[model samples]
Target chain A: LYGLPSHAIEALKCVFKEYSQIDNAILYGSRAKGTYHQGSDIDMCLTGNLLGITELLAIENKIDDLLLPWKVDISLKHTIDNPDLLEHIERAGILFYTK
Target chain B: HLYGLPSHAIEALKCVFKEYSQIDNAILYGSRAKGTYHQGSDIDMCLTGNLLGITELLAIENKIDDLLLPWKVDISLKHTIDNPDLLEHIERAGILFYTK
Candidate 1:
């Protein structure tokens, strides 16, 4: 019923467990609603930790490994020095899950 | 189509970020950040805040994305740790939004 299957979720959970420093992870766009068609992508948003390029690359590598069979797109967003924007997004969130 | 409300949408997005998260700081980093948003350019917002849970951040992103989708707007979250270049870029980029 969702764009990401159970296997994909398991893979993602593993990756995040290894790199638990990540402050946020998201599934967005059409795929988020379980209405994406074939070739649709899984959008990911990563926030908070100001990972260096090296760290970012490593995170990407791990994500790639997990999403190998599925067509997924991941976006890693490091919180910049923008307090206004950060506050805005935080207020906007509707809660996909809380745990 | 309609070219109206572009600024309104931009304002809406700004409001969203400011209201929920600890977005006390912001750096406009892309075309919008440079003040070059033409007729078709979308606003680019570089946001920053304290460390929060991954689930919380995801919730914020999803809520905002849906809010903007109806207005034909798009937002992309950028992690500060992922790009060291941002440290310097934030200093140089023309800031359209900022607060302490």
Candidate 2:
């Protein structure tokens, strides 16, 4: 329903399953903005109480490896410093997963 | 300016910036740049570049992530198409990291 390919959905599902602690997984940036091209990579943000660098790395690697050659940039929601970026994501980002 | 970071981290950032020598400029912002960072804070960077595709953007991020292992990093694009207010905010608060 998020305009993502079936494989991409499955890959995201795998990430959610692997990291059960994640409270929210948001798809943001161009993909969420609906201006993405074939060469566009996915931008995502994860939010949760216990989220840390290890979980971030594992999720990032799992998604990239699963989507092989398809790029994905994942960041922690709390770590974001740009107010505009945070606002944009909140306003337009697609909620792909939630706990 | 980079004294807030360890020598290794500073070196890593310098190396990463070298790979993007073609970029017009880069600014370091957020807690690290502001010098009020706590432990485990991520580094935030803004750059002006003519990134061709998502591959190029992701490659730069992935490489920097590798170099700054276990340290979260965020790289934002400051292109002409970006929001004027956002660009203004970055320009006002960000520290110059490099200029080509």
Candidate 3:
């Protein structure tokens, strides 16, 4: 079973490339770390720039649209507004980046 | 020693050692034998196989924690020999299974 879909990586790269304001993108969790199976979800973190909750939610919705046609699950994390939570994850394998 | 094994390999072995017996030692060898690591790499480890049960294995894990606390590391243990399928999976995954 495929873990992180090629499409998902492409989508992330595209977004980060266009959104130059973004400082980092981290891929973590079971999938990125190669310990996940078919039903696992892709976890991603976007770090950089301060944004209000509304803007953050909007970005999530946008990311959802970009990941079309993949039956796989997705989780989005914002690092700028929540460093403490992200710090725990960063300690794990922080794969991927456009920083 | 565990330090020389690929992180994932080290993790897998630690799991095995904890499940099977009390770990007497764990070390990284091979290219890392001299001391070095890289991206997309593997780690080698050596541990004593002498644990008898789950409770004993947990004790081994605790011991490992005390020994490794000074370094920046993360480790996890999984039960694999519990099933034939898992055994084959670990073999297929290229884990270097051994006892020291």
| Candidate 3 interface RMSD (Å) | 16.0
Instruction: Please list the residue runs of candidate 3 whose C-alpha ends up more than 4 Å from where it truly belongs after superposition.
Output: A67-87, B1-100
State the lDDT of candidate 1 residue by residue for B1-100, as single tens digits.
1132233344334445555556656556656566555656654555566654466466656755655334324333345445667556656774746453
Off by over 4 Å in 1: A1-99, B1-5, B69-79, B96-100
Q: Output the chain A TM-score of model 2.
A: 0.87
Question: What TM-score would every model get versus the actual structure?
Answer: 0.38, 0.47, 0.38
Task: Name every residue pair that clashes in candidate 2.
Answer: none
lDDT of each: 0.52, 0.70, 0.47
Which of the two, 1 or 2, has more lDDT? 2
Q: Per-residue lDDT tens digits of candidate 1, residues A1-99?
A: 354443345445445544546666665656555467766765555554655666667867866644355565545556335666445445443223222
Q: Can you tell me the CAPRI class of model 1?
A: incorrect
For model 1, the chain A TM-score is 0.64
Docking band of candidate 2: incorrect
**By descending lDDT, how would the candidates be arranged?**
2, 1, 3
Q: Over the stretch A4-68, how does candidate 2's per-residue lDDT look in tens digits? A: 54434544655675576798888898887768877777788888878889888887765654534
Give the share of true interchain contacts found in each model.
0.00, 0.00, 0.00
